[PDB]
Design an enzyme around this catalytic site. Structure first.
Site, PDB file in Angstrom:
ATOM      1  N   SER B  18      47.229  45.073  57.664  1.00  0.00           N
ATOM      2  CA  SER B  18      46.920  45.167  56.335  1.00  0.00           C
ATOM      3  C   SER B  18      46.052  43.969  55.662  1.00  0.00           C
ATOM      4  O   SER B  18      45.723  42.975  56.620  1.00  0.00           O
ATOM      5  CB  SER B  18      48.305  44.866  55.555  1.00  0.00           C
ATOM      6  OG  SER B  18      49.116  45.998  55.797  1.00  0.00           O
ATOM      7  N   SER B  65      47.929  51.023  49.344  1.00  0.00           N
ATOM      8  CA  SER B  65      48.872  50.135  49.642  1.00  0.00           C
ATOM      9  C   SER B  65      48.979  49.049  50.671  1.00  0.00           C
ATOM     10  O   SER B  65      49.630  48.135  50.557  1.00  0.00           O
ATOM     11  CB  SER B  65      50.433  50.901  50.134  1.00  0.00           C
ATOM     12  OG  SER B  65      50.405  51.757  51.274  1.00  0.00           O
ATOM     13  N   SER B  66      48.061  49.411  51.629  1.00  0.00           N
ATOM     14  CA  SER B  66      47.873  48.308  52.655  1.00  0.00           C
ATOM     15  C   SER B  66      46.718  47.307  52.330  1.00  0.00           C
ATOM     16  O   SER B  66      46.461  46.424  53.467  1.00  0.00           O
ATOM     17  CB  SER B  66      47.234  49.115  53.935  1.00  0.00           C
ATOM     18  OG  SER B  66      47.989  50.142  54.267  1.00  0.00           O
ATOM     19  N   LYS B  69      47.679  44.024  47.656  1.00  0.00           N
ATOM     20  CA  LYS B  69      48.712  42.750  48.232  1.00  0.00           C
ATOM     21  C   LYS B  69      48.341  41.637  47.833  1.00  0.00           C
ATOM     22  O   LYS B  69      47.375  41.084  47.881  1.00  0.00           O
ATOM     23  CB  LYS B  69      48.890  43.037  49.473  1.00  0.00           C
ATOM     24  CG  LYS B  69      49.344  44.450  50.118  1.00  0.00           C
ATOM     25  CD  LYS B  69      49.509  44.225  51.637  1.00  0.00           C
ATOM     26  CE  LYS B  69      50.039  45.594  52.445  1.00  0.00           C
ATOM     27  NZ  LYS B  69      51.673  45.506  52.164  1.00  0.00           N
ATOM     28  N   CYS B 103      56.479  41.918  53.371  1.00  0.00           N
ATOM     29  CA  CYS B 103      55.442  42.629  53.947  1.00  0.00           C
ATOM     30  C   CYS B 103      55.556  42.280  55.635  1.00  0.00           C
ATOM     31  O   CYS B 103      55.233  40.963  56.064  1.00  0.00           O
ATOM     32  CB  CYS B 103      54.109  42.388  53.676  1.00  0.00           C
ATOM     33  SG  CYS B 103      52.833  43.438  54.301  1.00  0.00           S
ATOM     34  N   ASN B 105      53.398  43.177  58.091  1.00  0.00           N
ATOM     35  CA  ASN B 105      52.135  43.079  58.611  1.00  0.00           C
ATOM     36  C   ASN B 105      51.374  41.548  58.029  1.00  0.00           C
ATOM     37  O   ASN B 105      50.876  40.860  59.052  1.00  0.00           O
ATOM     38  CB  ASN B 105      51.477  44.114  58.379  1.00  0.00           C
ATOM     39  CG  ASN B 105      51.309  45.319  59.346  1.00  0.00           C
ATOM     40  OD1 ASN B 105      50.884  45.015  60.444  1.00  0.00           O
ATOM     41  ND2 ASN B 105      51.810  46.311  59.007  1.00  0.00           N
ATOM     42  N   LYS B 228      62.152  52.817  52.044  1.00  0.00           N
ATOM     43  CA  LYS B 228      60.963  53.846  52.919  1.00  0.00           C
ATOM     44  C   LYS B 228      61.749  54.881  53.607  1.00  0.00           C
ATOM     45  O   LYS B 228      63.090  55.063  53.679  1.00  0.00           O
ATOM     46  CB  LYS B 228      60.410  52.992  54.092  1.00  0.00           C
ATOM     47  CG  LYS B 228      59.874  51.607  53.493  1.00  0.00           C
ATOM     48  CD  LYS B 228      58.711  51.957  52.614  1.00  0.00           C
ATOM     49  CE  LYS B 228      57.923  50.443  52.116  1.00  0.00           C
ATOM     50  NZ  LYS B 228      57.017  50.867  50.988  1.00  0.00           N
ATOM     51  N   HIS B 261      51.579  56.771  55.619  1.00  0.00           N
ATOM     52  CA  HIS B 261      50.967  55.548  56.003  1.00  0.00           C
ATOM     53  C   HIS B 261      49.973  55.736  57.192  1.00  0.00           C
ATOM     54  O   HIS B 261      50.262  56.574  57.944  1.00  0.00           O
ATOM     55  CB  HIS B 261      52.043  54.511  56.404  1.00  0.00           C
ATOM     56  CG  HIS B 261      51.607  53.210  56.442  1.00  0.00           C
ATOM     57  ND1 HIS B 261      51.200  52.554  57.572  1.00  0.00           N
ATOM     58  CD2 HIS B 261      51.739  51.945  55.644  1.00  0.00           C
ATOM     59  CE1 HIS B 261      50.844  50.993  57.398  1.00  0.00           C
ATOM     60  NE2 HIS B 261      51.093  51.072  56.094  1.00  0.00           N
ATOM     61  N   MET B 265      54.282  50.511  58.730  1.00  0.00           N
ATOM     62  CA  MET B 265      54.784  49.222  58.245  1.00  0.00           C
ATOM     63  C   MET B 265      55.552  48.304  58.893  1.00  0.00           C
ATOM     64  O   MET B 265      56.252  48.821  59.969  1.00  0.00           O
ATOM     65  CB  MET B 265      55.427  49.565  56.719  1.00  0.00           C
ATOM     66  CG  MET B 265      54.974  50.447  55.852  1.00  0.00           C
ATOM     67  SD  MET B 265      55.137  52.242  56.089  1.00  0.00           S
ATOM     68  CE  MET B 265      56.643  52.599  55.397  1.00  0.00           C
ATOM     69  N   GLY B 266      55.211  47.232  59.061  1.00  0.00           N
ATOM     70  CA  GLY B 266      55.776  46.105  59.794  1.00  0.00           C
ATOM     71  C   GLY B 266      57.065  45.989  59.610  1.00  0.00           C
ATOM     72  O   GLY B 266      58.192  46.063  60.731  1.00  0.00           O
TER      73      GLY B 266
HETATM   74  O1  LIG Z   1      50.795  47.484  53.589  1.00  0.00           O
HETATM   75  C1  LIG Z   1      50.921  48.689  53.763  1.00  0.00           C
HETATM   76  O2  LIG Z   1      50.019  49.640  53.833  1.00  0.00           O
HETATM   77  C2  LIG Z   1      52.072  49.126  53.103  1.00  0.00           C
HETATM   78  C3  LIG Z   1      53.325  48.879  53.344  1.00  0.00           C
HETATM   79  C4  LIG Z   1      53.721  47.486  54.437  1.00  0.00           C
HETATM   80  C5  LIG Z   1      53.051  47.257  55.778  1.00  0.00           C
HETATM   81  O3  LIG Z   1      52.055  48.286  56.190  1.00  0.00           O
HETATM   82  O4  LIG Z   1      53.393  46.582  56.613  1.00  0.00           O
HETATM   83  C6  LIG Z   1      54.459  49.407  52.631  1.00  0.00           C
HETATM   84  O5  LIG Z   1      54.478  50.603  52.190  1.00  0.00           O
HETATM   85  O6  LIG Z   1      55.516  48.716  52.482  1.00  0.00           O
END
Ligand SMILES: O=C(O)CC(CC(=O)O)C(=O)O
Ligand SMILES: O=C(O)CC(CC(=O)O)C(=O)O
Lengths: 385, 341
Positions: B18, B65-66, B69, B103, B105, B228, B261, B265-266
């Site tokens: 991300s 979404s990535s 942020k 988050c 990531n 999620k 995704h 996601m981390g």
């Molecule tokens: O960053 C994203 O793509 C979305 C995420 C978090 C992650 O990738 O770690 C999410 O949907 O929370």
């Protein structure tokens, strides 16, 4: 756990509201500029944020008419005496709203300024009237307050009645100069607010005093004689008002996305209007139809207001003077230089003469009388920042 | 009128798979130094939201979404922590910043940013070696430990460590999510409910079997996103989004998470490792059941290995930590601009 700090302050009634008033120079240094330190101090003084919604641990009274702060300073604006900053303190959130004027505390601003060395002493007579030229710093507008003087001091006491004020006090005439923003942001006297799946509502949207949306009582199934208990326990009604307010905010250009309204509760205001009808006010007094030119009820932070907001009174007077607005029509239509309106606590007269220039209406000032008095003076305390 | 834009010191970083805009708390305009409308409004404008066009061409966001942020970091006053970490997931289409989660990531970049920006006591940074950064994750009230490599007193960004979903290799950053189970692991009290495993570890996550939602577990974005919560399957071979074959032998299970995704996601990787370690969860069963101290799972962009050892005593399972490696690097550093608030 250090001792509480003390901050010089005066707790006053201005019109139909109460607030804590400070001179800028009396605030802790960190609070002498806008920002989080100032907000944190004021929140703690008032007793917010409070999950209990009672403000038992501060100076607030857990209503929009009592959760209020004012900071006054010598003005650096030409032809003004005092700068006036108003902070509407949230009851439930760690938030102080600086986006509007308080037209009720305006009444006390003149007196506080005179009593606390903020006005050129050459401007204060031994007896008579001290005309205080207020720079309203939230909205960038001039307000004139004519404060009576006796023996070189503010004359607080008197026999002037303001509906919504329990006891009479000295009359304070207030003049809101050039009230129009920076009058009709949509470019129209009346619009239809289309709220998909909930209805369509005729509305006058006006920027005068405070941005205000007026709708007809009848279009909501109301009569205009409603008191607080008719509305404030009706969650469906409250939600309906809020959606209409949001859509009006969108139509006025105040917000770009409809979801912005949830976090912008102070403006615009929403109110409803109706032709004259008799009713018993909140005090038990009968307001006869003949006593008023129209009825107006307004919402304040999502609940029916107990009387009428001072800024809203400016909006009512100004709208009433423009033939064709919903406010003007509720009052019978035609040119109008003043109106007396019925709100839940009684009546109020506002004067606002509109004059044509180049085929367009302009309004020099909206005028009304209030009163004010000191309730408590000394030092407020909060835990050390 | 129209006043000039303001400038706010910031760093734009890749953390894991991300990208985000990172700020020291003290560099924000004063109004934004506390939570509230002013902060959210500023972050929305930095990122380019809300955007009716859904492109974020008028800010720092990348319209996913990535890439939509923001991160606010400060030195922690909490005992046993170095840095306070606040994460804001900025909506693309609505005037909303979501503060409800971590988050996982960008977690990787938090440690590096903290070292690089004076948020950790210099005494705790080796001249050459590995700096252990103790992160207080303020959204969820959890400790996360990041082991960031140091060279000549500065963060070692570059390296040969590969993460699937990261285009170029970089230095390995080892991450430890301490006591990931919410203060519980299974809010329903059951490993499987009516069928879904619902677990609160890393982030609250709903896991369902791929077959039950009408899918195989090998899906890529284009199989779902024009049509999620996560879905799981046993190992199966597939071409990843990069064209590289993930062989069934390479993984213990497949996991796809939601838009679908692009990788994983981390926080969800924490949920996956944690759930895999508890015999009987849908995640554990997808990986063939039995005790597991780690799993490698297949996501659309490749694979990821997560460790989580669970210990049973008196019929209950507990997890001290979930671990994984990521990488991070600064992309741009200086000042972002927005119109005067
Ligand atoms: O960053 C994203 O793509 C979305 C995420 C978090 C992650 O990738 O770690 C999410 O949907 O929370
Ligand atoms: O502005 C409000 O909504 C509330 C007010 C202002 C006024 O009455 O003049 C209040 O109740 O004090």
């Amino acid at each position: 756990f250090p001792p509480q700090i003390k901050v010089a302050a005066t707790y006053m009634r201005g019109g139909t509201s109460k607030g804590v008033f400070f001179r800028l120079q009396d605030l802790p240094e960190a609070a002498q500029v806008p920002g989080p330190a100032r907000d944190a101090l004021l929140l703690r003084v008032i007793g917010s944020p409070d999950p209990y919604a009672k403000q038992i641990d501060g100076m607030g009274g857990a209503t929009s008419s009592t959760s209020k702060t004012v900071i006054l300073s010598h003005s650096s604006k030409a032809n003004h005496d005092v700068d006036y900053l108003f902070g509407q303190v949230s009851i439930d959130k760690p938030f102080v709203d600086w986006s509007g004027n308080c037209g009720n505390l305006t009444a006390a601003v003149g007196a506080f300024a005179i009593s606390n060395g903020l006005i050129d002493a050459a401007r204060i007579p031994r007896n008579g009237v001290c005309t205080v030229r207020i720079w309203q710093a939230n909205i960038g507008k001039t307000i004139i307050a004519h404060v009576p003087i006796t023996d070189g001091a503010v004359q607080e006491t008197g026999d002037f009645e303001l509906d919504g004020v329990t006891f009479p006090a000295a009359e304070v005439q207030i003049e809101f100069m050039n009230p129009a923003a920076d009058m009709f942001p949509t470019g129209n006297l009346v619009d239809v607010l289309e709220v998909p799946g909930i209805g369509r509502f005729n509305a006058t949207m006006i920027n005068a005093g405070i941005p205000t949306i007026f709708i007809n009582a009848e279009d909501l199934g109301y009569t205009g004689t409603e008191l607080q208990d008719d509305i404030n326990s009706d969650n469906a009604a409250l939600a309906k008002f809020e959606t209409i307010r949001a859509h009006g905010a969108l139509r006025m250009g105040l917000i770009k996305h409809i979801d912005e309204a949830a976090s912008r509760q102070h403006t615009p205001k929403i109110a409803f209007v109706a032709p004259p009808k008799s009713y018993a006010s909140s005090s038990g007094k009968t307001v006869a139809a003949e006593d008023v030119d129209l009825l107006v009820r307004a919402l304040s932070m999502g609940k029916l207001h107990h009387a009428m907001m001072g800024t809203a009174a400016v909006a009512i007077g100004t709208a009433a003077a423009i033939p064709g607005t919903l406010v003007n029509l509720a009052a019978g239509g035609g040119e109008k230089e003043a109106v007396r309106f019925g709100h839940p606590s009684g009546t109020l007269r506002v004067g606002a003469q509109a004059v044509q220039e180049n085929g367009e209406w302009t309004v020099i000032k909206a005028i009304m009388s209030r009163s004010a008095r000191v309730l408590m003076e000394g030092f407020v305390r909060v835990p050390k920042p």
